[PDB]
Amino acid sequence: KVTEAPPFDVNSLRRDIEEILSEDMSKGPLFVRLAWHEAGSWDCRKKDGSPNSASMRFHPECSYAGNKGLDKGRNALESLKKKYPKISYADLWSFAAVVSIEAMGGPEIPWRWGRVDAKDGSVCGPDGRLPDASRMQDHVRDVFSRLGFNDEETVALIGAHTCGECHLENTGYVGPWTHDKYGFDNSFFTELFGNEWMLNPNVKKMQFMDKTTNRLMMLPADVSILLDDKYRSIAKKYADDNDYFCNAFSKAYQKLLEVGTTDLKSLPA
Ligand code: HEM
Ligand code: NA
Ligand code: NA
């Protein structure tokens, strides 16, 4: 459709977002959580939640349980915003996530610019939009169905737990999903199937740890892919073919960063 050079140097910003990661690879996954959290307020029946507008900059959305710790995300981008002031926060967040999935070795995800920032909290959809980790496949399905994803998409997207880790101080959940949390591959689904999960007695919010090492963790929501026959099957394929996986995630995540958007423009070469 519409291709246009954007009002910022996209290859200078790419290069800087990558520079941010080299000094601190812990921002990569965090950057992927923030864009997702900025997309996941959406309702495709209700056409609301203000997804992909950096509405999370405002109250009440900034204060919701599911978005705790994401200030580190926003603050870690506030200087690239000074240095590239013709970029909306919504473009900067979605672009930093896309770059961060490339850097950690995942797929190169097609990215279009044109997102327009909420200028106050009044378009801020309600809470309970973000998924509850403490819940199971029926809640998971209820959320990603309101967001507009199929079962293939939902499981692909939750694949993102392949990178990053949970923080006591953020969600009272603790530790990484894989032994390579700065890598983005299908090893979430690897580690899911190729372990025995068991209660972690040491954490007040119910989570699972791996029998082998006790170093990996899984959320009730995560382990619900194994209990849910449908999710299980797809989870199997992704565990078995990182490419079906890496292709699945690329299209799903791009769709996530463009739910509730119009007038987006392709980058030229
Ligand atoms: C039912 C669905 C999901 C639930 C319940 C869930 C829950 C969680 C929780 C509790 C954390 C830890 C937050 C923290 O303490 O720092 C987390 C981390 C993360 N999640 Fe999700 N999530 C889900 C789906 C997704 C999706 C769709 C993505 C990306 C598309 C994603 C990407 C991440 C990433 C990258 C992190 C790591 C954050 C960091 O390392 O700083 N999750 N998720
Ligand atoms: Na939003
Ligand atoms: Na990895």
Author numbering: 57 to 325
Authors' account:
One of these is a hybrid heme peroxidase, the T. cruzi ascorbate peroxidase-cytochrome c peroxidase enzyme (TcAPx-CcP). TcAPx-CcP has high sequence identity to members of the class I peroxidase family, notably ascorbate peroxidase (APX) and cytochrome c peroxidase (CcP), as well as a mitochondrial peroxidase from Leishmania major (LmP). Like LmP, TcAPx was later found to have both ascorbate and cytochrome c activity and was thus renamed as TcAPx-CcP. Integration of steady state kinetic experiments, molecular dynamic simulations, and bioinformatic analyses indicates that TcAPx-CcP preferentially oxidizes cytochrome c but is still competent for oxidization of ascorbate.
